[PDB]
Ligand binder design. Structure first.
Ligand code: NI
Ligand code: ZN
Length: 359
């Protein structure tokens, strides 16, 4: 599995900052998710940064903004360099122990996974490689990325290091971003327009990536979404103004350790149960990955699980058919899975991808 280092450029570390990654000539962060930040504020890394002065962290503008809203990562401020999207950027790497100098060009491509999420395309003197980070690309999106191409064909890519979360034929198709959004929108609309006392709880994981759902709901329905904390979007106006810390709203995305018990007793995680002593009428909506097989057809993005509860199709990652389409299009020499799906093995995932690769 992926532990920070690509074979072709081992002196850079991406989305992993412990163990062998402590000797990196440069760091890269694809997106601000805990699973891709292992060791990023460890004492040993800080120790190492005090020694090595020409070591930087590179990421997208949004990732820089998000990361540094957390006090615990503020020590990175002096060493963090953002790179604009789809803007090829020369990066110089120097050996601390040896004398060595090394030059690479990096291009950030949007990953469709959460605010600030990118893929990193690296070009240097040891071939071109693509690190996808976490991604969801719909069909046709890769073909529109001009900087994946050279002279009207895809660039010669030696190796792709890719998000294989749903790389198993069972996860053949997943409804699109737009389909998922429209389903949730119409469910919420149909509830909250009944009266001011009808409210929705969006039961979401504690992670970036639900913001486009919140913004669309807010934009379409003229309501702000209750969240526990929104200071990370202080400088992000197109997100911030769709959120609120006030409990007096019809759409909630607040969180609590016992939030599901609270919902079973008609509460809501933030504790509001009534207004003018009228009980709030609450439905829960849990964004959840849903998929259909190769020989099946799409069914409703909304799944009712109780009188007052729903699951709603939502995915942070590409389907199997999207992964195969992406890799087929890239046609690299090698493809390496970043992640093994829960019910599969590395050998099955590698062999799924192998026919789409040149060696
Ligand atoms: Ni992620
Ligand atoms: Zn709330």
């Amino acid at each position: 599995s992926f532990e920070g280092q690509m074979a072709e450029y081992p002196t850079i570390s991406i989305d992993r900052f412990d163990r062998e990654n402590l000797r990196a000539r440069a760091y890269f962060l694809s997106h601000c998710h805990k699973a891709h930040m292992k060791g990023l504020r460890a004492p040993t890394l800080k120790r190492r940064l005090e020694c090595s002065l020409k070591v930087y962290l590179y990421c997208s503008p949004v990732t820089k903004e998000l990361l540094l809203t957390s006090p615990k990562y503020r020590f990175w401020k002096k060493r963090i360099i953002s790179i604009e999207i789809e803007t090829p950027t020369q990066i110089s790497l120097v050996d601390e122990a040896s004398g060595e100098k090394e030059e690479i060009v990096v291009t950030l491509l949007p990953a469709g996974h959460c605010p600030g999420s990118v893929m990193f395309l690296f070009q240097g003197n040891n071939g071109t490689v693509l690190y996808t980070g976490d991604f969801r690309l719909a069909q046709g999106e890769a073909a529109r990325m001009e900087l994946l191409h050279s002279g009207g064909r895809v660039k010669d890519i030696q190796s792709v290091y890719l998000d294989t979360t749903f790389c198993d034929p069972r996860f053949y198709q997943i409804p699109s971003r737009e389909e998922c959004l429209s389903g949730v929108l119409e469910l919420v609309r149909s509830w909250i327009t009944r009266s001011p006392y009808h409210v929705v709880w969006l039961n979401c994981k504690a992670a970036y990536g639900y913001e486009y759902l919140f913004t669309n709901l807010s934009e379409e329905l003229g309501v702000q979404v209750h969240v526990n904390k929104l200071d990370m979007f202080r400088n992000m106006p197109e997100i911030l103004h769709h959120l609120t810390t006030d409990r007096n709203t019809q759409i909630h995305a607040c969180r609590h350790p016992k939030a599901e018990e609270y919902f079973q007793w008609s509460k809501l995680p933030c504790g509001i149960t009534s207004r003018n002593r009228i009980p709030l009428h609450i439905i829960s909506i849990k964004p959840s990955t849903m998929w259909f097989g190769e020989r099946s057809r799409k069914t409703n993005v909304i799944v009712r699980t109780g009188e007052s509860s729903y699951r709603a199709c939502f995915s942070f990652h590409s389907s199997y058919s999207e992964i195969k389409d992406f890799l087929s299009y890239l046609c690299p020499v090698n493809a390496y899975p970043n992640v093994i799906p829960v019910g599969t093995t590395m050998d099955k995932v590698v062999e799924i991808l192998k026919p789409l690769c040149r060696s």
